[PDB]
Amino acid sequence: QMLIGGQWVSAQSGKTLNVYNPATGDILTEVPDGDVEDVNAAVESAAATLRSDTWRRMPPSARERILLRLADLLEVHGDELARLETLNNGKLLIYSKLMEVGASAQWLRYMAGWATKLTGSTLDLSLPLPPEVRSRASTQRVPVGVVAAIIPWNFPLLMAVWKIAPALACGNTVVLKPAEETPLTALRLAELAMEAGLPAGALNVVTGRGETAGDALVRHPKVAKVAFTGSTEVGRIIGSACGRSLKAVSLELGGKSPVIVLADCDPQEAAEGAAAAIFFNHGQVCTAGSRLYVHESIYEDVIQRLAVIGESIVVGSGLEQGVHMGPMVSKKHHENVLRHIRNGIEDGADLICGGTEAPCAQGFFVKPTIFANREKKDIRLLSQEVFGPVLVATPFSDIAEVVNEANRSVYGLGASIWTNDLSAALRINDELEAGTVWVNTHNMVDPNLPFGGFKDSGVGREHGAAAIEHYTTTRSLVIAY
Amino acid sequence: QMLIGGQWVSAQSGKTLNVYNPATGDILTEVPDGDVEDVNAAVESAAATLRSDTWRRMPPSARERILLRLADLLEVHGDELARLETLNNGKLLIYSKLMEVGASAQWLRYMAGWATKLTGSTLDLSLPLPPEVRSRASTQRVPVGVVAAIIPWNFPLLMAVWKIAPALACGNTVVLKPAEETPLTALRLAELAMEAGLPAGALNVVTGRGETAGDALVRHPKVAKVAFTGSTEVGRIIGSACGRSLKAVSLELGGKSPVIVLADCDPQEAAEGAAAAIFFNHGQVCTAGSRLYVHESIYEDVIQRLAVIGESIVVGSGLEQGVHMGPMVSKKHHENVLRHIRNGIEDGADLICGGTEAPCAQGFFVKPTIFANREKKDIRLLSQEVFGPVLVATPFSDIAEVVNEANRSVYGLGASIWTNDLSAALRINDELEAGTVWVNTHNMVDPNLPFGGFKDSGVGREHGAAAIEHYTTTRSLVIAY
Amino acid sequence: QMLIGGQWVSAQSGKTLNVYNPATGDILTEVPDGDVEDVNAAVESAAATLRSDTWRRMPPSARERILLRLADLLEVHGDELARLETLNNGKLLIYSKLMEVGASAQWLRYMAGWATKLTGSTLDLSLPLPPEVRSRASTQRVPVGVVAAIIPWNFPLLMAVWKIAPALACGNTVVLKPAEETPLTALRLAELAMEAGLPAGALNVVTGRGETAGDALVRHPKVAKVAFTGSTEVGRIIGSACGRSLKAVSLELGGKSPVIVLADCDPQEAAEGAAAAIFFNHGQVCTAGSRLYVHESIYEDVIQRLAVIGESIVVGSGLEQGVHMGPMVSKKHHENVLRHIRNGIEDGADLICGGTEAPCAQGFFVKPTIFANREKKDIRLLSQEVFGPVLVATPFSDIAEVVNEANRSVYGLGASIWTNDLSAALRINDELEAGTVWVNTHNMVDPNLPFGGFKDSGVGREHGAAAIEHYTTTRSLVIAY
Amino acid sequence: QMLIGGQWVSAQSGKTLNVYNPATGDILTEVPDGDVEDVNAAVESAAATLRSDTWRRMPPSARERILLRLADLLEVHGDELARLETLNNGKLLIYSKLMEVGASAQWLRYMAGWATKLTGSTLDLSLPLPPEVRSRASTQRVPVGVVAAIIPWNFPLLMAVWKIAPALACGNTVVLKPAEETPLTALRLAELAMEAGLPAGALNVVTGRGETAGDALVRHPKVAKVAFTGSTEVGRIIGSACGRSLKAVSLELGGKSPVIVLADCDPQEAAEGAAAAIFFNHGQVCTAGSRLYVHESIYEDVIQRLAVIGESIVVGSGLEQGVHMGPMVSKKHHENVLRHIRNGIEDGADLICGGTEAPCAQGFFVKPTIFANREKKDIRLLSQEVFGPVLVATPFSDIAEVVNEANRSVYGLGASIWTNDLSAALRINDELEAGTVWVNTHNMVDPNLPFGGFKDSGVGREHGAAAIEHYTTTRSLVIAY
Numbered sequence A, B, C, D: 001q002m003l004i005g006g007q008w009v010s011a012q013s014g015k016t017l018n019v020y021n022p023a024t025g026d027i028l029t030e031v032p033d034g035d036v037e038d039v040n041a042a043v044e045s046a047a048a049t050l051r052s053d054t055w056r057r058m059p060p061s062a063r064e065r066i067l068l069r070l071a072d073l074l075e076v077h078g079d080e081l082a083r084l085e086t087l088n089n090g091k092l093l094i095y096s097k098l099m100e101v102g103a104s105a106q107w108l109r110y111m112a113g114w115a116t117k118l119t120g121s122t123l124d125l126s127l128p129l130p131p132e133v134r135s136r137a138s139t140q141r142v143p144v145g146v147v148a149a150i151i152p153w154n155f156p157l158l159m160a161v162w163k164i165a166p167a168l169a170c171g172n173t174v175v176l177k178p179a180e181e182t183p184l185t186a187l188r189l190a191e192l193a194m195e196a197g198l199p200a201g202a203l204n205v206v207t208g209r210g211e212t213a214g215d216a217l218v219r220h221p222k223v224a225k226v227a228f229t230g231s232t233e234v235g236r237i238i239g240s241a242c243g244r245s246l247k248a249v250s251l252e253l254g255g256k257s258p259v260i261v262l263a264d265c266d267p268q269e270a271a272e273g274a275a276a277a278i279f280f281n282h283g284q285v286c287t288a289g290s291r292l293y294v295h296e297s298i299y300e301d302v303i304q305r306l307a308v309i310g311e312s313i314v315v316g317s318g319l320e321q322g323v324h325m326g327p328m329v330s331k332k333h334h335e336n337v338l339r340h341i342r343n344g345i346e347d348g349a350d351l352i353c354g355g356t357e358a359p360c361a362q363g364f365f366v367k368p369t370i371f372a373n374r375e376k377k378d379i380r381l382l383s384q385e386v387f388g389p390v391l392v393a394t395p396f397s398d399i400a401e402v403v404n405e406a407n408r409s410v411y412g413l414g415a416s417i418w419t420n421d422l423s424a425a426l427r428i429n430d431e432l433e434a435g436t437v438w439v440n441t442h443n444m445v446d447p448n449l450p451f452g453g454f455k456d457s458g459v460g461r462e463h464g465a466a467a468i469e470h471y472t473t474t475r476s477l478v479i480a481y
Helices: A040-050 A063-075 A078-089 A093-099 A102-112 A156-170 A184-195 A210-218 A232-244 A267-283 A299-311 A331-346 A399-406 A422-429 A466-470 B040-044 B046-050 B063-075 B078-089 B093-099 B102-112 B156-170 B184-195 B210-218 B232-244 B267-283 B299-311 B331-346 B399-406 B422-429 B466-470 C040-044 C046-050 C063-075 C078-089 C093-099 C102-112 C156-170 C184-195 C210-218 C232-244 C267-283 C299-311 C331-346 C399-406 C422-431 D040-044 D046-050 D063-075 D078-089 D093-099 D102-112 D156-170 D184-195 D210-218 D232-244 D267-283 D299-311 D331-346 D399-406 D422-431
Strands: A016-021 A026-032 A120-123 A135-143 A146-150 A173-177 A203-205 A225-229 A248-252 A257-261 A289-295 A350-353 A369-372 A390-396 A414-418 A436-439 A472-480 B016-021 B026-032 B120-123 B135-143 B146-150 B173-177 B203-205 B225-229 B248-252 B257-261 B289-295 B350-353 B369-372 B390-396 B415-418 B436-439 B472-480 C016-020 C027-032 C120-123 C135-143 C146-150 C173-177 C203-205 C225-229 C248-252 C257-261 C289-295 C350-353 C369-372 C390-396 C414-418 C436-439 C472-480 D016-021 D026-032 D120-123 D135-143 D146-150 D173-177 D203-205 D225-229 D248-252 D257-261 D289-295 D350-353 D369-372 D390-396 D415-418 D436-439 D472-480
Touching: A016 A078, A026 A184, A040 A146, A040 A173, A040 A203, A063 A078, A063 A102, A063 A156, A063 A184, A063 C102, A078 A093, A078 A156, A078 A184, A093 A102, A102 A156, A102 C063, A120 D135, A135 D120, A146 A156, A146 A210, A156 A173, A156 A184, A156 A225, A156 A466, A173 A210, A184 A203, A210 A232, A225 A232, A232 A248, A232 B232, A257 A267, A257 A399, A267 A289, A267 A299, A267 A390, A267 A414, A289 A299, A289 A399, A289 A414, A299 A350, A299 A369, A299 A390, A331 A390, A390 A399, A399 A422, A414 A422, A422 A436, A422 D422, A466 A472, B016 B078, B026 B184, B040 B046, B046 B146, B046 B173, B063 B078, B063 B102, B063 B156, B063 B184, B063 D102, B078 B093, B078 B156, B078 B184, B093 B102, B102 B156, B102 D063, B120 C135, B135 C120, B146 B156, B146 B210, B156 B173, B156 B184, B156 B225, B156 B466, B173 B210, B184 B203, B210 B232, B225 B232, B232 B248, B257 B267, B257 B399, B267 B289, B267 B299, B267 B390, B267 B415, B289 B299, B289 B399, B299 B350, B299 B369, B299 B390, B331 B390, B390 B399, B399 B422, B415 B422, B422 B436, B422 C422, B466 B472, C027 C184, C040 C046, C046 C146, C046 C173, C063 C078, C063 C102, C063 C156, C063 C184, C078 C093, C078 C156, C078 C184, C093 C102, C102 C156, C146 C156, C146 C210, C156 C173, C156 C184, C156 C225, C173 C210, C184 C203, C210 C232, C225 C232, C232 C248, C232 D232, C257 C267, C257 C399, C267 C289, C267 C299, C267 C390, C267 C414, C289 C299, C289 C399, C289 C414, C299 C350, C299 C369, C299 C390, C331 C390, C390 C399, C399 C422, C414 C422, C422 C436, D016 D078, D026 D184, D040 D046, D046 D146, D046 D173, D063 D078, D063 D102, D063 D156, D063 D184, D078 D093, D078 D156, D078 D184, D093 D102, D102 D156, D146 D156, D146 D210, D156 D173, D156 D184, D156 D225, D173 D210, D184 D203, D210 D232, D225 D232, D232 D248, D257 D267, D257 D399, D267 D289, D267 D299, D267 D390, D267 D415, D289 D299, D289 D399, D299 D350, D299 D369, D299 D390, D331 D390, D390 D399, D399 D422, D415 D422, D422 D436
Parallel strands: A146 A173, A146 A225, A173 A203, A225 A248, A257 A289, A257 A414, A289 A390, A369 A390, A414 A436, A436 B472, A472 B436, B146 B173, B146 B225, B173 B203, B225 B248, B257 B289, B257 B415, B289 B390, B369 B390, B415 B436, C146 C173, C146 C225, C173 C203, C225 C248, C257 C289, C257 C414, C289 C390, C369 C390, C414 C436, C436 D472, C472 D436, D146 D173, D146 D225, D173 D203, D225 D248, D257 D289, D257 D415, D289 D390, D369 D390, D415 D436
Antiparallel strands: A016 A026, A120 A135, A120 D120, A135 A472, A350 A369, B016 B026, B120 B135, B120 C120, B135 B472, B350 B369, C016 C027, C120 C135, C135 C472, C350 C369, D016 D026, D120 D135, D135 D472, D350 D369
């Protein structure tokens, strides 16, 4: 049932839709197939509550304490939420416990401490009013309003914290739509939010097929900001709509993160580096390093080792022991990931590791695949975001060459340099058109580190002290006395 | 003639268009009627130069010195730029010297100051990586790219500074389009920019009819941000376009600023207050206080005085002595302002001052007009932005009612409260949905005060420390060592 | 016992000293009478631990968690800590629960959230190295070192959490000395700190007579900062010592807060206002408003009411029901407070309420006393901090003279204006030489509000974002490549 | 003469003292030998003016414009001020023009832009007053008061700007005492300050022997902050005095900056690196890298080259062509520098370059001297700040040993690492106890980079955004409405 107004409610049509277990591939359950009737209640309920005095004028340590008490309840309820994720998403249970239950609790805490530290400024001003007059001028940080939150399916619990945590800190209320392939952990989130002391209406969860629930949410006259993450294309649709609506928009869209191994870097470290950069969360990560660039000198050395690493990954259920990777989240994405593997074989790249052969009997499983692009043929899997465990590994002679190739992308979100060369590392980072460069790591995210991309990877920044500016605004006040 | 690449250049079609003096309704001159050929060159020239190592890697006190030198040349060339404005815009010469030549120079200085003070952060990190592996994280403030700047016709020199000053501080380059009713002062601006040491291509000025030059600028794949101010409608067009383009957008659109006189406020100090709130810049100001709300008790007292004040305004040429108000900027706006005066007489409001008759023989002149909305009827001089010297003055009994009326607008840009009452003043400001409240003043703008509106008045904030956050972005860097 | 290194330890001399109960003035218990042997162990133990990798390089959400769990354990152990305070300090039990157990938990939470948000900057640089020589420059927020914390006896739990909470957030370790009249609640604090996960040595508590334990702490070569609050005189001893030592110093010394009632303010509200301003905490508060200034017009009206209010205060034990005020903390302070009452009767002021007679049979009890200084004599009780429930109430004609009188003090910590006059209120605040003005309140302290005084009331600010800058410092880093 | 109140004034005793040319040992001129009569006038004059409404309530772009117009007059009067320095200080004329006239103008500009951007905060609050009562709480950045500025003799114009520029930006007034070996450029500074529009009394310059003028300045009851730089000893004296006075103190004392050459760094770059690190400003620089540490492998290679470099430095007058180094500033410092060279020969170090013989016939000239400490003896030329062109060069085997040696100093002001190893460089910087590490450079100072040292090198930070926290403070304001 969904949550709207403190109330577990079904869809007004009494229509419904199936969620699956991606390992076996069967129905796990049902959830409500909501439409524009039920986005509306939910958005009118948050606007009710944003104006309520009990939320608007809630002292600031009380809103810090709600977010504190729920991080305390994600961790107290954390075996159950972790089995839940693994069930719905396919993800390895230990990673559900650590990176979804546990990183989620960490983001709450962090953002909960902002609730109490939200400041404007106190200003000088050369006006200049008549004499015998004086003036005092300030800005006042205030909330943005009702937040439309649309979450992607790769990290359902977390990617929902990543929006609600910072919106609630600010004094915004939210209407949250989880992906249709994964709604269960946000439903639990919402009811633990209320156990922690969050007033009815402050966090509503609407469920449904993306085509319609989504659209209704975006095009609502009482929605003040839209925080989307997903397909970079649908992000354009949201953009257009939000801009003629004059509403604030947060957009985290696609990536084709490159990873760059310089001459002096150790081959065992580089190939262990690359594997972690792209087989983490089955490659289902905006920032996954799907383009590997290794220097001419150690190129083969590196890709040899790397195929040993990927050959030895065991694919299986997320609750089984001995398993390193799990499945894709849906059967449409499984089919899309396999079509890209397949265009890659036809485009003349070298399959060193992987293919399209099903690792299991049931489920949306893909084998971890590596393509070697020796001969620098721009197959265009160098352009395609896959969002699955697929790597293309190309070589390079100069550093100027690799930099150019890294920035021959339409996306620009992340990147890695692997090196103990200060000059180079820092001067590659100088020239990369990437919004979050890592050096001798990849995929590292923190509640205090802002995140966003350049180009076609979105508009805006996500965490840290960037959150606060994007979930707050100011009003000015100038008093002549 | 227009500027593109350090070069005074005509339009490629050779086509041209007339600018006028609004006082003696005559051609003043001609300027280029540019099209999508010449937005193109200009936008490819700024992108050439933004990538320029000269500009990208210009030390930060060198970019501070260009903006300082040119505030020093706005003031050294300031009789000429002030005659220019008055000629093209209609504005009173002393106000050209003070509020266009002199406030601009002040803006430059101020923003030139933040050139040198643009910072990112240095951050903790709870990651984590293996033991014996330590990390450093930071963000780095960087420029947004090529700036599309579209300027309104009410304050041609200043409104242009308001954008170029903060974009250039940041390391952005700009392509500036002035209104078609007023291009001359931005042309002079551009050539003084180069006398001050600004490299060719850093500030291009394209001219033309808004319908086409504008559109080309907005829809250019190499334009990184769009800073528009004008009709709130056209802003919606820009919004849509910018959001499907994934580009940052600055929008300062309409208003209908209310001004509120409480019971205890002196009555002549209120009427002198209101007159300044709406006859400043012949009411041609986004924030002009076009709705007057006075308490029941002193309502008549106040509007009596106020009509004495407006009756005694002398309308004339901007270079003549004895003149208090000048003209409208164009004949289309003159005609629109007169149509609103006229709907107001038919909608049953009381003309206590002003009207539809022409004060002068030549020119786009309007008499300052006051309508009394005794009876508290929702005619339509209340929901329509006039942008001319027209006031509707309504009464009110409670403070809750006036607040409600102030926020029965589709815009929330500014507002005034007039009072010695701390509680009330501060608790009105609490409840107003206005982005910049003044108390015992109106229309006060600083370089250090952020400015923006709520609702239909735009997206984003403009000055102060809000300008750096809107003309910069960050890239993250995390080094594992 | 006292805490040093995770260890409950007695003094090396075996010497000991009595703590008492201010309400029945008998021994409550004994605690260590530590000397320079046992300041030394304790300060060598914090320096051991500050250099500890575990503590220095503790991830930043782990240090946030410790402070969060221990706010969670002040509140879980909160009836016991509240009985403890009331026992040792004399304070009313409800206030112990609310303003010592409960404000302390609030301060933890708040500062615990800064643990994770401590940032430096990332900077531009006009240098200027050779060409082809690019550089990146940052500052890095780091901890100050070992903190010597000396706490006053009026709010033992809280005043301790005022210092340890912000030092531990920062990554500083601390050596805490509580007053000798009140050590028990900081001893409990220290052991709950360890139950919450604080490593041994991070918070040591040394106990003893102020003369010697104190001095040893201040003059220790390994103490990096000194945070003192108490007698403004002893503060100058600490000053001298700290400055020849080249150590950072926090000093919160004396006050003589004035409170100002303007003509228009309501008499019942003003006198209820003043009573709360000076009978809160039995007047044992740096910021207590011990000077009352009321306008000529309503002066008598106000002081009449006020004596009704103070006459009706019931003085008694802190655990008894029906009691509004409790005792002084020690018998030396009781005797000093009574000597000032007595000086005041001889100096010719009018006792309108209270006096020198003992309300109770046992204990350090004082009656709440009001002196009417009609005639405006420099009855030099207007220059003496009492720190007890004693008020002098003087009248005034012009606002310029009240402002003069407010700033005829050697202190400048706090002040109140009572009025509903915007111009006057803001403008008085303009001219007051006070570090924290309140308007229509007094004695209001937040975790987010900085606190400090001017003149003889100290050096430095205490809370908010002022804490972080006083408990951190920066190192710069400039890399040429 | 001296400046006090806009007035060029002689000392009250009529007593006077000689200033010298350091190249040709001769009187250059005379200046006032002021005493406690004339510190007093000067400090009573700044306090007159700080309270001045003209200065206190000077709009903030007017104070920005004074500092702007005087950077513009440092550069317009810049051949003369540069001949002046060279005359009085001994410094090479081109460096007078570039690093004293020109860096000084840069510092003005930079700090002048912070005049305009000085902000407090606007805060939330968990109070919690009754219900029905709302509150608004802010801090307000204000100036510290009268500034006692004592300047060192190595960079007379600049070191003076370093203080006055940031104090005046803030709204502080200053009383400036230049060294007694160099007063002329601050006298010119002061009169150009007034040509730029600085009101009389805002910058007074008192002159005299350090023993007495200094003391009077420090111990003045109306001096609010003391900004000293010089002997670390005298800094202790100031410390003690300032702390019993309860006044803010800025102290930039001594350094023994180490410089560290790792195995992989190029020998000619390292030795060119070290020479610049210690023969810049004739070694008369707090941060001069007077300890050289080179790895075992390339140690000899490096010191060979380095002696070629120092052997080829030509010592001479600052206005002569072909000269690379000039003289010491006084004959007492010349004699002290030569005594340290001489203890170094007796302590058994290897003179590879330079010595004790006089390069010239007249003047305070020293030859650039390098001592090789093979054998790693604590000769203690490493424990003594020379402030002259003297280097000790020691070798080292592991990186842990060099780090230990770098932090076997009583001062930790600056340091250099030379390498192209990212791990090591970052890490070395991790473990150094130095307040400003450089990598592949040394001696680099910006207006935007904070500067200060650890240990015995002082208290506080100097530039950037650290200035504006040290030259401002806040007052809090909480309004209950």
